[PDB]
């Protein structure tokens, strides 16, 4: 179900970050995630994986290229659920034809803003408002730490969308 499409995304983000940003799990981080609280979780085991790197712009491009690549592979009736995911997570009213750019334009214009590039706080914190899952097997997710506040901003943006799919 949802987990089948998030796992390939969490593994395309990882791969693209390793060939497009020369990253690794063994690589030091400019910014690390301190605490991952999920206000109201019910079946979401969200672990923070460290895949840090240096080109903050390439991290943002890699996650976007991974987010878009995973979107084309969706079925026509499945990619119809997405315009609700934006409107629920970012209140950006979009349509199936206008998603890919309006995601990019949000990510590029929000995650390169001075408010996220100049945080200077190395220990950051992630706050996801909602997430739901089954008791027997919870939806399993990951916050890939890119190492930068702007690249992690894109992950959080992508993360805010997927957690809004369970509802």
């Amino acid at each position: 179900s949802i987990q089948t499409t998030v796992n390939t995304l969490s593994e395309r983000i990882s791969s693209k970050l390793e060939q497009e940003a020369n990253a690794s799990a063994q690589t030091k981080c400019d910014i690390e995630i301190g605490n991952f609280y999920i206000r109201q979780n019910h079946g979401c085991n969200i672990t923070v994986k460290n895949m840090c790197s240096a080109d903050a712009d390439a991290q943002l491009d890699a996650v976007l290229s991974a987010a878009t690549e995973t979107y084309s592979g969706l079925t026509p009736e499945q990619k119809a659920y997405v315009p609700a995911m934006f409107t629920a997570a970012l209140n950006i009213q979009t349509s199936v034809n206008t998603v890919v750019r309006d995601f990019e334009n949000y990510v590029k214009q929000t995650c390169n803003s001075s408010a996220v590039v100049d945080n200077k706080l190395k220990i950051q914190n992630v706050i996801i408002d909602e997430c739901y899952g089954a008791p027997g097997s919870p939806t399993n997710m990951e916050f890939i730490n890119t190492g930068s506040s702007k690249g992690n901003c894109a992950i959080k943006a992508l993360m805010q969308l997927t957690t809004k799919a369970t509802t």
Partner: antibody
Amino acid sequence: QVQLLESGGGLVKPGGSLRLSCAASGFTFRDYYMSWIREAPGKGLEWVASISRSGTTIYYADSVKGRFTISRDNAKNSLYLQMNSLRAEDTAVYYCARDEASSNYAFDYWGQGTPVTVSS
Amino acid sequence: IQLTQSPSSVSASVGDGVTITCRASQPIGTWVAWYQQKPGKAPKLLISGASSGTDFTLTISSLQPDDSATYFCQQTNTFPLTFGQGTRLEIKR
């Protein structure tokens, strides 16, 4: 004006235990990866452990893995390396450093050094 | 990962040049740092890099008798952080 004072080293018998401490002063401890490095008598500079700014991601070496434990208390500005199940190969002078998070990852300041000798 | 430092022992007089190389196995990138350990003293840093990586060099040129020490190289981005064999410099007299 930065310094890193090491303490806790000395003589123990094989299988012994020492908690080496590193008291920091002069910077924001919360913003630096703190590490521990061992120089064996005469020859060899070798890494032992490294801890993050929150203590959430801890990386060790393979020779000291499963035995040693690194930790940190950022309010008392200290770094510790608990050396359990010691052996003779771990006889060395142990340094603590501050990886340059704010600048270029590298050890800009090291510590004086606490000597550890493990013999029966 | 494994950094292979050469030459293990070099010696040139005051005012002349020495060349120390930290040839690596895997491409490490631009992340190499060089360290100086004065005899019997805690190691100190000299130079650093950041952003291939198979070969790297360090040339200390205006040699002073104060530069007699042991020099080490290190992978500063990827764990396990490994150092080099180490090169001892001796200033001639």
